[PDB]
Symmetry: C3
Subunit: 331 residues, 3 copies
């Protein structure tokens, strides 16, 4: 599942310093190996924020001149991320055992690790969200056998035509949106209809996970002869679709290919926008798609809106990319 | 050509034959990289855009009404709709969907990057397999931007300005307009077409360059690290241009995207590095010029264009002994509508 | 105070180019030194924006005129003209992330360079070191998109956008002739048939100050709106020079004491100071554990390389996960409770 470090991706100095550049996408692993020392696996294991700030609470079903209240367990709550509080956890392990862990944020970039056999190693990781956090709100329903947490657009959330308040307030704002005597009933159904196909938010306890993002690390090694490899290009005539291009569930395109040639090798990947077959429009999330002796074959990418053609050598598949949207209209 | 040559300081050659090259490519900025016995290659940032950004609020500039009695009420009521082609629509960028297209051509390969897509391998032919790692950087604070477009037709407006626009609004797909009474005064009178009042408020506001579906940005850069193998990289170093031989081709002016642009002519020996700085009137020791142009140079045929950011107030730009006073206006969300 | 550049942090090329990678947090200094040349101190001196854009103005105290309807700037049920009291506004300011300046200073044992998101590269003539290319990637310590500077006529705070936007007070933009939602500071009593009672809710400065308790303060130095969090990551390019390579030994874990026990920095981080009684200079062993696991290090240092120098050192800044944590500085330990995120206290 791990890609090997290539010669081009590291530099060895006259004064014995090795500078390595790793691009680690969520779930992506790179194997770094030095002479006489066991090979180490380096990967981005998680992207999350624990307990993000609660913003507006929307009422889905209004209750009760007497004050308008909300029905029991009938709220839709918003949560906002703090881009500087999101944790990117990098794990280092040989080949559990001598597994090192380092967490980074926008604010915390540098750490010195004692990689045992590789000695004191400097790790400088620049984090990069796969989500435009400024335009995101986590919409969550009250605990009751369905997805009840979504990643919605800020402009959609803020203009939700429902009564609202902040936790601690004892008065609902714009309660006349469900009340007046006129009562409009439970709007959970209308909301769920609008949230169809919208990315679900992975919450594991207090950890609010992100399913997209990477880290670009500058690794500093001292006094060691780094074993560098170079991949040959995979034969374009020996690819098959294990998994044809599909929506990842976080605004990317995922696919998996089968290789029936000599391994390991570099996967030839490109995409063309309809009309121009010369320009490559594939923007890979997978920094180096390869076929390994062990595994390999999974490719993630961004594509322009419209009709595209993905090429994995001579293997092709058309892909229609939908345009951007703040969400479906709610009334 | 405005292509700058790669300098010795901008690359490192390893013991195990690896060359690491750092390029700073601002929109329209080009760098020429050259290897021993191999032809020279031009590397530039060609475009920054997002295709079809998400539609946010639609504002009504001119109310279309029905007969007196999705309604505005006094009791007398009218049905309030919008006039044909009289909307002002908002569009939001997805920072991770903005494409930064890098082109490589001798003296042709294309690679696109986003916040999410940073790495590619490109077969540059005589240079072999080349790893390209580009960190993209918007020249616009995207979180505080809304693209306002009429049915110059488009502008880059501040989010806080857009959100508080005193006009009726709705989202694409909604039947009724919110706050329709903003264009209805009570006998029912219509406040008329507000396009004129809006155009007056949008004066001098940065225009949004829309090329079909491509919503362009005219500000931004990419910082790339280039990995080359088994090749003798040519190392060139620019001498500083003579401070006494500069003259204004185009005196400092607004770029149209919150920067200061200018052009200079050089009468001395070329090519050389342009000496550029600025001082806040009163403080003459501190350099306050923040160049958008990573390496301003005078080329044998070409060079002389300088882009920079400056602090608010009274500044004095220096291109060697050549000087020009520049007044920098402060930040604003926009004019009150 | 200044830490020394380590061997791992720089690479020397075959064609005589040295590439140094510096991480400079606000107030953090790194000493770079070359054989036969004087030492140079490199630090991030300031992070600020001059005159950020003014957004909404909120009224804290209503200036109600004459108690007597189709007019703009009145509250009705009898009608009174509603304006704001003199110097009783709470103004919002938004940063332009691309307009924030990160000033790097270089001095022996003096040159200045300013960077922004948009301006990354500059060439400096470091004198004894010759022409040095400086490429600094700036990084705000504050999520600017979710921040508003709230200032009164302590003067200013960094508040959350969602909190600011939903403030239950009358508002307007500079230049507008009338206040929106002015009825938020007007109260109407039972009518006396010939006259109706009109009350003013009074000055709300007090209620606001109570809600802004513990909220990070905005440091305004004239026109300069400062940030107290953030760093810059610089790629420093040097020519034809023998760069001195130093490597720190690890500090003895048994010789640390608390000069200052873990505390809130005032900008969403944890700060502390330790004293060292062993042989100097050395690298400080710093780690932290959270309730969730005892094996995983959860300390996210703001201080790129905490060291004990001959000339000071011992100050450590870090981010920690929410909840119960235990900070370790060798064998020296201290528990730290980290409060979770919040847009702010409910304002009435």
């Amino acid at each position: 599942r791990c890609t090997h470090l290539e010669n081009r991706d590291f530099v060895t100095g006259t004064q014995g310093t090795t500078r390595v550049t790793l691009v680690l996408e969520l779930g992506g692993c790179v194997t770094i190996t030095a002479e006489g020392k066991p090979s180490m696996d380096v990967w981005l294991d998680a992207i999350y924020q624990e307990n993000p700030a609660k913003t507006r609470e929307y009422c889905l079903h209004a209750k009760l001149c007497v004050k308008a209240a909300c029905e029991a367990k009938k709220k839709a709550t918003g949560h906002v991320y703090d881009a500087n509080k999101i944790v990117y956890t990098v794990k280092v392990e040989p080949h559990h055992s001598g597994r090192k862990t380092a967490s980074f944020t926008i604010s915390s970039e540098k750490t010195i690790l004692t990689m045992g056999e590789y000695g004191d190693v400097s790790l400088l990781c620049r984090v990069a969200s796969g989500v435009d956090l400024a335009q995101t709100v986590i919409l969550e329903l009250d605990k009751t056998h369905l997805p009840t947490a979504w990643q919605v657009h800020r402009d959609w959330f803020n203009d939700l035509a429902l009564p609202w308040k902040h936790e601690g307030a004892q008065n609902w704002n714009n309660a006349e949106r469900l009340v007046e005597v006129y009562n409009l009933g439970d709007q959970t159904g209308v909301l769920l209809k609008a949230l169809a196909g919208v990315p679900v938010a992975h919450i594991e306890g207090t950890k609010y996970h992100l399913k997209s993002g990477h880290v670009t690390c500058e690794v500093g090694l001292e006094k060691l002869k780094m074993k560098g490899l170079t991949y040959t290009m995979c034969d374009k005539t020996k690819f098959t679709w294990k998994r044809a291009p599909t929506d990842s569930g976080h605004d990317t395109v995922v696919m998996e290919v089968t290789f029936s040639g000599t391994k390991p090798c570099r996967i030839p990947v490109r995409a063309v926008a309809h009309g121009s077959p010369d320009v490559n429009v594939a923007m890979l999330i997978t920094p180096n798609p390869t076929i390994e002796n062990n595994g390999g074959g999974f490719i993630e990418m961004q594509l322009p809106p419209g009709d595209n053609i993905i090429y994995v050598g001579e293997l092709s598949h058309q892909w229609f990319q939908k345009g951007s949207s703040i969400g479906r209209v709610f009334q």
